[PDB]
Amino acid sequence: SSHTVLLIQTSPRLDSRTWGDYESVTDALDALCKMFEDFLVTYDVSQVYEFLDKLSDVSMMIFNRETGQYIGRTRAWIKQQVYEMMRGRCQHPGSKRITLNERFGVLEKGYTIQA
Amino acid sequence: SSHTVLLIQTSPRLDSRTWGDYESVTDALDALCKMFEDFLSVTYDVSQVYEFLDKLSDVSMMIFNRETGQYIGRTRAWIKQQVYEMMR
């Protein structure tokens, strides 16, 4: 499981920027699927891609244990992961927290925090 | 220059989590003092910026590293050290 930071901007207003973090990539992707359902029963593939395209911004920082650093991933990659997670539920045509500050500080000392 | 993400949480509410990104660490630190100056609206000493950063529920930077093509997480303590050097 790779600690993941999710960067989102819902509207073109800069103050709609928010972030969350997750113990795994799968959890961060799941959170996006839940955001998509909240913005709506049944949905087709195009709705998921266009929900993700309509976000003014969406990207992830994914922890890489071998370097102790974070790989950046942007919308094109996220859309393919989210589609794969959502593919079985889409219609188609035819038919108590850790702060980032503390976590980065433990990391600077040579340690990872592991769920 | 290193692309920089500034991540903040201003209150204990998870909905106070916000971010900005910048083409340089300089731009990100500049952006952070401007946040503090607006709360201040006067001069201030380093202690005052330090206290401002302490009262944030979370503050960090993620800074692009060209050797790895990956981002390094920087702590609030790291940020205060750079603020200090911006003021010596």
Numbering used by the authors:
A (entry chain A): 4 to 43, 51 to 105, 123 to 142
B (entry chain B): 4 to 44, 51 to 97
Manuscript excerpt for this entry:
To understand the molecular mechanism how TOST-1 binds to ERH-2, we made a similar fusion protein by linking ERH-2(1–103) with a fragment of TOST-1(34–54) via a (GSS)6 linker, crystallized the fusion protein, and determined its structure at a 2.20 Å resolution. In the TOST-1-bound structure, the ERH-2 homodimer is similar to that in the PICS-1-bound one. However, only one TOST-1 molecule (aa 35–54) is visible in the structure since the crystal packing prevents the access of the second TOST-1 to the symmetrical site. The TOST-1 fragment (TOST-134–54) adopts a helix structure with two extended ends, and the helix is accommodated into the oval-shape pocket of the ERH-2 dimer. The helix of TOST-1 (aa 39-48) interacts with both ERH-2 protomers, ERH-2A and ERH-2B, via hydrophobic and electrostatic interactions. Leu39, Phe43, and Leu46 of TOST-1 make extensive hydrophobic interactions with Val8A, Trp22A, Phe73A, Tyr80A, Leu10B, and Met71B. The main chain amides of Leu39 and Asn40 form are hydrogen bonded to the carboxyl groups of Asp67B; The side chain carboxyl group of TOST-1 Asn40 is hydrogen bonded to the main chain amide group of Arg85B; The guanidino group of Arg42 forms cation-π and salt bridge with the side chains of His6A and Glu26A, respectively. In addition to the helix-mediated interactions, the Arg36 of TOST-1 forms salt bridge with Asp24A, and the Thr51 of TOST-1 also makes additional hydrophobic contacts with Phe73A. By using ITC binding assay, we found that D67A of ERH-2, R42C and L39A/F43A of TOST-1, abolished the interaction between TOST-1 and ERH-2, whereas the ERH-2 D67A binds to EBM in a comparable affinity with the wild type (Kds: 4.3 μM vs. 8.5 μM). In addition, those mutants abolishing the ERH-2/TOST-1 interaction, including D67A of ERH-2, L39A/F43A and R42C of TOST-1, all demonstrated delay and nondisjunction in chromosome segregation and cell division.
By using functional proteomics, we and another group independently identified a piRNA biogenesis and chromosome segregation (PICS) complex (also named as PETISCO) that plays important roles in 21U-RNA biogenesis, chromosome segregation and cell division. The PICS complex is composed of TOFU-6, PICS-1 (also names as PID-3), ERH-2 and two mutually exclusive factors, PID-1 and TOST-1. The PID-1 containing complex is functional in piRNA maturation and processes piRNA precursors at 5′ termini via its association with IFE-3, while the TOST-1 containing form is essential for chromosome segregation and cell division in embryos. Complemented by biochemical and mutagenesis experiments, our structural biology data support that PICS is an octamer composed of two copies of each subunit, and unveil the assembly interface within PICS complex.
